[PDB]
C-alpha cells in the first residue's frame, strides 16, 4: 500500500502514469490573479526561482511528518536501483516537480526540519522540470511495491535464423549450463564494453 | 536546427506528453515534428503478436525482430540515428545529448518486456547508425519514460524548440528574503559580485563532495 503525490505546475505531463497517485496543480496554492509561482533569483543569473511561499503552502497541505518528500534536482543525489527498492516500502511519497531554474533551497530545508527530505538526481543530463524525472521514479519505485551490478546480456526469440542472422546455437542446445555461462560471459563482456565503471574501471 | 523523431511502442499514449510540451511556433517554423507509431501496426498475425518465448529459456517475454524489422524497415533512412534504451545501454549523458541535438531525424524504438531480439539493432546497424543507451541505473517496465527524458533532454538543446533559453549547481533563492525563519544567504544582496561568484563556487564545491564525489 503506497500513496503518491505529484506536485507540478504542469499536471498535464502526468497523465502518462494497493496505491494511488494524484496529481495537484501547484498554482491552486496562489492566491493573486496572475497566479504567479516564480521571481527573479538573488544574488544574480538568468532565469526565474519558484517561490518558497507558494510550495510552502502547497506542502503543508499534503504533507505529513511520515513523508518521504522527494524533490527531483540535476544537483540531487544519485536515484539508482538501490533508491528504488528503498522507497519501494514507504507509506507516502510526495513528489515536488520544479521547472524554471528550480524551487527556493528553503522549501527542502524547510521541510527537512519535520519529514524526511531527498533531493535526487535521475541522471547526468540536463531536463527541462522535475515531472520526466517523476515519472521514471513513479515507474522504477512501483514495480517493486510487493504485490506488484552487470548489464544484461543480449535476449533472442523466434524465428531461430532471421535475415540471414542467427539465434547464438547454445541458445538452442538446450544445455542449461552451457546456457547459463554463455549468458554470463555476454553480461560480463557488454559490461566491460559499455559500462566499465560498474566492474571498477576507468570510464572512456 | 531542425529535427524529425518517431517513435515506436507498444504504448502510443505514454507519449502524449511530449507532442504537449510542443511550442506551436516551432512546429510552425518546421524546426521539429514527433510522430508517435504504434509497434502493431507492422504485427503479422490476427492476435497482433508483438513477443515470443525467449531462446535459452528464462521468466519474461522477448520481442519478436520480425514485427520490429517491418517497423524499422519503414520508418527508417540512412540517415536516421536509431535510438534503443535499455538498461544495459551506454551511459545517455548530457555530452549525448549535445551529440544527438544536431541530428536531422531520431527513431526511437521503445521495447516492454525482457526487451527487443538482439538481431533486430544488429541488423539495423548495417545500414544507419544505432545507439543502444541507458538514462540510468535503475530498471524500468519499458523504454518509453526513457524516450520522454531522451526527448526532453534533446529538444531543448535545439534553439527555440522547447521555449526555454564540471560541479553540480549550488542553492537558488527569491523573496522573500526571510520565510519561516530563513534567510537569504546576506553575500547575495551584497552587491559584491565577485564575491557572489566565489560564494557560489564553494556551495557548488561543497554539494559536490557530498551528493557526486566521483565527480572529483
Ligand atoms: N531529477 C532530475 C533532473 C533534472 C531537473 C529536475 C528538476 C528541475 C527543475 C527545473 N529544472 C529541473 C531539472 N534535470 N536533469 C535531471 N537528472
Ligand atoms: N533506457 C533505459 C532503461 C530501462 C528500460 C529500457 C527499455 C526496456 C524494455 C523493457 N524494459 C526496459 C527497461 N530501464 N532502466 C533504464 N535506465
Known sequence: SM?????????EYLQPVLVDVAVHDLRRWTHDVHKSVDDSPYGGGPGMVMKPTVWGDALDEICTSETLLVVPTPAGYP??????????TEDHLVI???????????VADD???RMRVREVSIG????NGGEAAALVIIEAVL??????????????TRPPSWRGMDVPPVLLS???????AWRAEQSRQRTIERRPDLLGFDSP
Open 3 to 11: 500513496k503518491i503525490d505529484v506536485v507540478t505546475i504542469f499536471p
Open 174 to 180: 538446450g544445455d542449461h549450463a552451457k546456457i547459463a
Open 124 to 127: 547526468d543530463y540536463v531536463l
Open 79 to 88: 536515484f539508482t536501483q538501490e533508491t528504488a527498492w528503498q522507497w519501494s
Open 111 to 113: 521541510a527537512a526540519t
Open 96 to 106: 515536488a516537480c520544479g521547472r524554471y531554474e528550480g524551487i527556493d533551497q528553503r
Open 143 to 156: 514495480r517493486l511495491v510487493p504485490g506488484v551490478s552487470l548489464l544484461e546480456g543480449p535476449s533472442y
